[PDB]
Design a protein around this nucleic acid. Structure first.
Length: 1322
RNA sequence: UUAACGAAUUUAUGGAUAAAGUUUUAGAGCUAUG
DNA sequence: CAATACCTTTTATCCATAAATTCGTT
DNA sequence: TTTAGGTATTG
RNA sequence: GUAGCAAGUUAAAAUAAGGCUAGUCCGUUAUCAACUUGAAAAAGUGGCACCGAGUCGGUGCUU
């Protein structure tokens, strides 16, 4: 006797209940608690607000760095352990000095100067090496035995910050000059080729090779310069190889098989010698030189500066930055003294000012500093070098900046190696550990391995050869690299849907291939002259046709079936094939790829081999790493020739199948003894399909399957499995939590109907006209020019693609008056450009029931073709216009018109249906078939969207929040109505499998029967034709829908949420004497070191106890709100009382402590409502019930997108504006009584009241839209800033929570209907 | 996901890296003047 | 107190799986 | 990409 | 303490407090009104009809 309608969203679930006669019911509700209100009446319509669901991405990203840091302190710890023994010979407490660099001298346990204890040599250190980058160059270059403490600093500084790993392979410091490497490339080529020598001469390899241009475009430019050799010539392939590329040297040597080489792809160190052996080892000396050039080019963009003098280019690159910075500072500091020496104190001494003082000591960024001084630079003379350096963006540069990290880790290794090479002569431990120390810089946990766990990480999957601790140097022996890489993909590979305990098989599985071919073959029927009736293929032919045609060629066409098997083997001269399409969809693609390599067809058929062949494709599909395949396949090398194995490693397969082995060949019928595959051949004269095999109550598969699946799952996992945005799953879980409570209210009765709905270019318009009159060549673009912002007006925009001519009339159109001209939909209602057309009269097409008539098509069949070839209309736009010559819009073509519109295409909503439908219908009849008690309808969102605009139920989002329940009411109404008159469409809307045909087919505008009068008659009492059931009464029902819409009480609930996440604001705050300064790590008093600030408050707790007051220390009873933070929450839950006493409370009444989560609800005094927004802040209580005539008004007053509808109704819409023009004073009057009652902000309303008095002379459409902003003052929520016209009005925040503590607390259930009220007294 | 196969984008989940920011300390501030 | 103003770490790179979505095919 | 709660200081 | 002037670019150390299961691991996603029952997961609990509508009000019947 009822129906539920839902409207699911991101931040809200909408819900309304509808009757046979479409009233929304009401009911008296009991109220718990100590308050005198023991019952309340509430309408069975509402909505549920909540904060959006948050994606794990933000969180995971924090996990990367959380690890990235606990792995970097570990990398420096590895350096120290090597030095620890040897350094103690040099400095007893060098490292201890560093560990404590952060501690203040009062807390420091050693000397204050780290590199050396003494103040005197520490000064001279910075005196000679102002940057580490300075020292790095010295540590690379000198031959002198430099102090061990310094060597550590340079090396550790490279290991602390490596640069990136986006290059594999090695680069060298020697390969910097491309010409010196280029000539070495030519120089070698002539020491090998005395018959066709080349020459360097006058080519600029440096500029040409190292350019932003394409790795191809640079190629052509170089061979163009040299005397004219071919890109295909040997030299070009060598130039091509050096530029990252994939040359084919087969052309020059004319080898039997093509061999191609890339300098990023792995197959290179191998590919050289496999090709090189045929040519000879002498040739290799060339290719290494070509590789060398490639490395010169690669780092050519990264180290742009000259670097010939030193082996340490990067540090040299810094030292120039520091020296340039120093030079230009003096010149700047000078030139300001010279001409403008009044501003200089602001510039170099004021930290706040984004000056150089702000740039260094203040927090000003390089972009902020640059912007700040660019004006001052151009007021003083000599500022050219300075300014050309500022547009270059290289002026007074810091050394460590955002743009580093374009640096690849290799060039650091080049300096580390150089230092290590220098000083190993002086320090023995260095020579031994040089390999061991470089690996620290070089190592990187390979991603497929993952976090190195000991079963104690949810994320980790790796496998260990020995249970011992992992260092970068023993990684290979302890970590089972491969099996991790298999576990790596396997944990993300889908499971078998039918049997979800077993892993899915590889897509190219040989077993899967057969399964896939025999399943298409079992349903093949052949008709021949001899036979009376068509018959399925039998067991021999399936087993014969596969052996005969599928093993012979890759794809099997139907013509091959009759000629190659039917005629040749069965000697049937003519036959007809019923089941299959033209070619067999399935293929034995793995069979043949395998066949060619091993060349042993006998090997492929012995079922003794299936496990051996399956494993190769499992290992062949799974693994990325060429090294790894070999370790796995070696087990098979005895069976196979040594040449065979070489090809197998090459073949890679990508992709995962649909079904497990256990499903196809494992599961067996207890009675038949046969498997699914074995039933797929030889099923008897009745040959059954795969789906058919599972769905036979006689066989054990329906009994075996269901045993595995029930073994079901809880809702969270049922919900979490759903694919799509994690925030919209919150609305889904909540929307199903909503439905479950509604049934409880209706006396645990199930409802018959359920309607669900979920809701979901400025310059583009200029270019489809720009180029469409360039191919037209017409001057209508020049005759009238326009701007890019105008084209969101429909009628203006249609003119331009049309060229000013009517498709229905063929005449030139006036530019000024388009209001009289109609926008015409090609198909009677689509509002897109694909189906919209602009003509003076929409009747010129002919019958408005019909497609534009043959009379206009004969006039304009050519003109719309000019517009297609100029892309001024789309083929769909054209094909719908032209369709009048293919018999017009066919009944089945018109069926495609409406049917496509009605059904929800979105896969997520469908699942929502199963969730509800399978959660509603539990009973099963005596037959296996399901009992369809509740009908789950999924409604499109546009259908209701037009319904509001059509039928005077206009929606305005921001005045109020009721429109969410309104959207649900309107979904329950339009849905139950559409299924009441159309059970044939039950299958199309409802999740039910029932059955619907397309054949039936007069108007393709589905939304018509509601209409009392329709633009060209319908009775006001509607009934289904066949059953006689009365479905819609236009006179009786439409009043109740406006009556329901215009209701002043709806349940609006904000889901209460404990707050989770980060402890506090992330910033480090400088030292302070505040007691709100949170310690960063225990030993650091934030007053001395600085700490955190601004904790997030998880939830507030209510405390009634005594505290000490005054020097008197008299205990007096206080009742207040304590804010439990996230950091605090752990301690609090263990012992609330002890935790409380530490906060200062005494004599705490434990029983009465109430944990108040965010958004908690309090009613105080005259029924104004306050939401607890924090321990110390509050949020707005109630939503303002502006009467419906205004909502309908303000939507029409706002004059939404001008007017879309028909112009004759639009005049009435315009008339409505003026007739109710005095409402603007009534609207503002509505707010004031609502403001005074609930909102308690007089301060603001008065400037508001004063603002509205001022703009009475401004037009209504301008005035009405600005009035809308004002409601954000009344909106339930958080105070926020709004502006009227030109006046910004600040927010009024409620910085005290006193008033709440003596009020009544409202605990509300998910719908809002069940309550428990608690009056608060001490 | 279509029939059925492929391709691509986007979103979801995960791994391995990088460069900045922020905070305390170390980089003897001097010269007139109480 | 309650106004009033101010504050809130960011930006890159590579690899993988899966759905959903909108293109293609012989 | 802006929300809306901490935080400190004023008239 | 004020006025003059020199100066600045670099570094170490922390990067959610921290936890035990001490791993080159883990620590910001999801989930949550209330009350009874539960270690949790989870289960349990709230008569109806009519006239009406500024945020639910009244009446009749049962209770």
């Amino acid at each position: 006797k009822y129906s539920i309608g839902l409207a699911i969203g991101t931040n809200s679930v909408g819900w309304a209940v509808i009757t046979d006669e479409y009233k929304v019911p009401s009911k008296k509700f009991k109220v718990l608690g100590n308050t005198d209100r023991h019952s309340i009446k509430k309408n069975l319509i509402g909505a549920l607000l909540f904060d959006s669901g948050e994606t794990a991405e933000a969180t995971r990203l924090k996990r990367t760095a959380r690890r990235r840091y606990t792995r970097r302190k570990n990398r420096i710890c590895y350096l120290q352990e090597i030095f620890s023994n040897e350094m103690a010979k040099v400095d007893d407490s060098f490292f201890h000095r560093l560990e404590e660099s952060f501690l203040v001298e009062e807390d420091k346990k050693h000397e204050r100067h780290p590199i050396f204890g003494n103040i005197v040599d520490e000064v001279a250190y910075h005196e000679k090496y102002p940057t580490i980058y300075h020292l790095r160059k010295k540590l690379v270059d000198s031959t002198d035995k430099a102090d061990l403490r310094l060597i550590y600093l340079a090396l550790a500084h490279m290991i602390k910050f490596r640069g990136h790993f986006l290059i594999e392979g090695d680069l060298n410091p020697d390969n910097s000059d491309v010409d010196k490497l280029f000539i070495q490339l030519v120089q070698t080529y002539n020491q090998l080729f005395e018959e066709n020598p080349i020459n360097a001469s006058g080519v600029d390899a440096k500029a040409i090779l190292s350019a932003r241009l394409s790795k191809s475009r640079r190629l052509e430019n170089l061979i163009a310069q040299l005397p004219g050799e071919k890109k295909n010539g040997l030299f070009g392939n060598l130039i091509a190889l050096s530029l990252g590329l994939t040359p084919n040297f087969k052309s020059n040597f004319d080898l039997a098989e093509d061999a191609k080489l890339q300098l990023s792809k792995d197959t290179y160190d191998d590919d050289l010698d496999n090709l090189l052996a045929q040519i000879g080892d002498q040739y290799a000396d060339l290719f290494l030189a070509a590789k060398n050039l490639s490395d010169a080019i690669l780092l050519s963009d990264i180290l742009r500066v000259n670097t010939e003098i030193t082996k340490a280019p990067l540090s040299a690159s810094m030292i120039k930055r520091y020296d340039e910075h120093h030079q230009d500072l003096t010149l700047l500091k000078a030139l300001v003294r010279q001409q403008l020496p009044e501003k200089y104190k602001e510039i170099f001494f004021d930290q706040s000012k984004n000056g150089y003082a702000g740039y260094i000591d203040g927090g000003a960024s390089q972009e902020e500093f640059y912007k700040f001084i660019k004006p001052i630079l151009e007021k003083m003379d000599g500022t050219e070098e300075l300014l050309v350096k500022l547009n270059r963006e290289d002026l007074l540069r810091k050394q460590r900046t955002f743009d580093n990290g374009s640096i690849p880790h290799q060039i650091h290794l080049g300096e580390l190696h150089a230092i290590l090479r220098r000083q190993e002569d002086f320090y023995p431990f260095l020579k031994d550990n040089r390999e061991k120390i470089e690996k620290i810089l070089t190592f990187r946990i390979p991603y497929y391995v993952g976090p190195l766990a000991r079963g104690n990480s949810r994320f980790a999957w790796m496998t260990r050869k020995s249970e011992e601790t992992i260092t970068p140097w023993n990684f290979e022996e302890v970590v089972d690299k491969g099996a991790s890489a298999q576990s790596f993909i396997e944990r993300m590979t889908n499971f078998d849907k039918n049997l979800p305990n077993e892993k899915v098989l590889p897509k190219h599985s040989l077993l899967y291939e057969y399964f896939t071919v025999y399943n298409e073959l079992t349903k093949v029927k052949y008709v021949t002259e001899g036979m009376r009736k068509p018959a399925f293929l039998s067991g021999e032919q399936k087993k014969a046709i596969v052996d005969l045609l599928f093993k012979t060629n890759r794809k099997v066409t139907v013509k091959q079936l009759k000629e190659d098997y039917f005629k040749k083997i069965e000697c049937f001269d003519s036959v007809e094939i019923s089941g299959v399409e033209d070619r067999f969809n399935a293929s034995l693609g793995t069979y043949h790829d395998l066949l060619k390599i091993i060349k042993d067809k006998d090997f492929l058929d012995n079922e003794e081999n299936e496990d051996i062949l399956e494993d190769i494709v499992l290992t062949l599909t799974l693994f990325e790493d060429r090294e790894m395949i070999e370790e796995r396949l070696k087990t098979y090398a005895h069976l196979f020739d040594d040449k065979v194995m070489k090809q197998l490693k090459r073949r890679r397969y990508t992709g995962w199948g649909r079904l497990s082995r256990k499903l196809i060949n494992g599961i067996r019928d207890k009675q038949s003894g046969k498997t699914i595959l074995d039933f797929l051949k030889s099923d008897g004269f009745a040959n059954r399909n795969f789906m058919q095999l599972i769905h036979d109550d006689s066989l054990t598969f329906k009994e075996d399957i269901q045993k595995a699946q029930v073994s079901g799952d809880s809702l969270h996992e049922h919900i979490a499995n759903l694919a799509g945005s994690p925030a919209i799953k919150k609305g889904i879980l909540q929307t199903v939590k909503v439905v479950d409570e509604l049934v409880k209210v209706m006396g645990r009765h199930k409802p018959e109907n359920i309607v669900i709905e979920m809701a979901r270019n400025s310059r583009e318009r200029m270019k489809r006209i720009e180029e469409g009159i360039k191919e037209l060549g017409s001057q209508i673009l020049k005759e009238h020019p326009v701007e890019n912002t105008q084209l969101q007006n429909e009628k203006l925009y249609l003119y331009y693609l049309q060229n000013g001519r009517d498709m229905y009339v063929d005449q030139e159109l006036d530019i000024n008056r388009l209001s009289d001209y109609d926008v015409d939909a090609i198909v009677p209602q689509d509002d897109s450009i694909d189906n919209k057309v602009l003509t003076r009269s929409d009747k010129n097409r002919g019958k408005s029931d019909n497609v534009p008539s043959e009379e206009v098509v004969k006039k304009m069949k050519n003109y719309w073709r000019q517009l297609l070839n100029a892309k001024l209309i789309t083929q769909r736009k054209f094909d719908n216009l032209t369709k009048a010559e293919r018999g017009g819009l066919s009944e089945l073509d018109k069926a495609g018109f409406i049917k496509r519109q009605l059904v929800e295409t979105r896969q997520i909503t469908k699942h929502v249906a199963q969730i509800l439908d399978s959660r509603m219908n539990t009973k099963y009849d005596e037959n296996d078939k399901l009992i369809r008690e509740v009908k789950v309808i999924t409604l499109k969102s546009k259908l209701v969207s037009d319904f509001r605009k059509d039928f005077q139920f206009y929606k305005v989002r921001e005045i109020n929040n009721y429109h969410h329940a309104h959207d649900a009411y309107l979904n329950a109404v339009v849905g139950t109505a559409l299924i009441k008159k159309y059970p044939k469409l039950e299958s199309e809307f409802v999740y039910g499998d029932k059955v619907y045909d397309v054949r039936k087919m007069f108007y393709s505008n589905i939304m018509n029967f509601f209409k009392t009068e329709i633009t060209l008659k319908r009775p006001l009492i509607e009934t289904n034709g066949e059953t006689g059931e009365i479905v819609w009464d236009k006179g009786r029902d439409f009043a109740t829908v406006r009556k329901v819409l215009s209701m002043p009480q709806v349940n609006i609930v904000k889901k209460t949420e404990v707050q989770t996440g980060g402890f506090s604001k992330e910033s480090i705050l400088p030292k302070r004497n505040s007691d709100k300064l949170i310690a960063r790590k225990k030993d650091w008093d934030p007053k001395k070191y600085g700490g955190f600030d601004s904790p997030t408050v998880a939830y507030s707790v209510l405390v009634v106890a005594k505290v000490e007051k005054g020097k008197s220390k008299k205990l007096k009873s206080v009742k207040e709100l304590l804010g439990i933070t996230i950091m605090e929450r752990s301690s609090f839950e263990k012992n609330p009382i002890d935790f409380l006493e530490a906060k200062g409370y005494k004599e705490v009444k434990k029983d009465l402590i109430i944990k108040l989560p965010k958004y908690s609800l309090f009613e105080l005094e005259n029924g104004r409502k306050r939401m607890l927004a924090s321990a110390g802040e509050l949020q707005k209580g109630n939503e303002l019930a502006l009467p419906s005539k205004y909502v309908n008004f303000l939507y029409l007053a706002s004059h939404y997108e001008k007017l879309k509808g028909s112009p004759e109704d639009n005049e009435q819409k315009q008339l409505f504006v003026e007739q109710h023009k005095h409402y603007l004073d009534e609207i503002i009057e509505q707010i004031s009584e609502f403001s005074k009652r609930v909102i308690l902000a007089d301060a603001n309303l008065d400037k508001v009241l004063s603002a509205y008095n001022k703009h009475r002379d401004k037009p209504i459409r301008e005035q009405a839209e600005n009035i809308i902003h004002l409601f954000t003052l009344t909106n339930l929520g958080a105070p926020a800033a709004f502006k009227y016209f030109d006046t910004t009005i600040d927010r009024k925040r409620y910085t005290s929570t006193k008033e709440v503590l003596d009020a009544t607390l409202i605990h509300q259930s998910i719908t809002g209907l069940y309550e428990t009220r608690i009056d608060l007294s001490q």
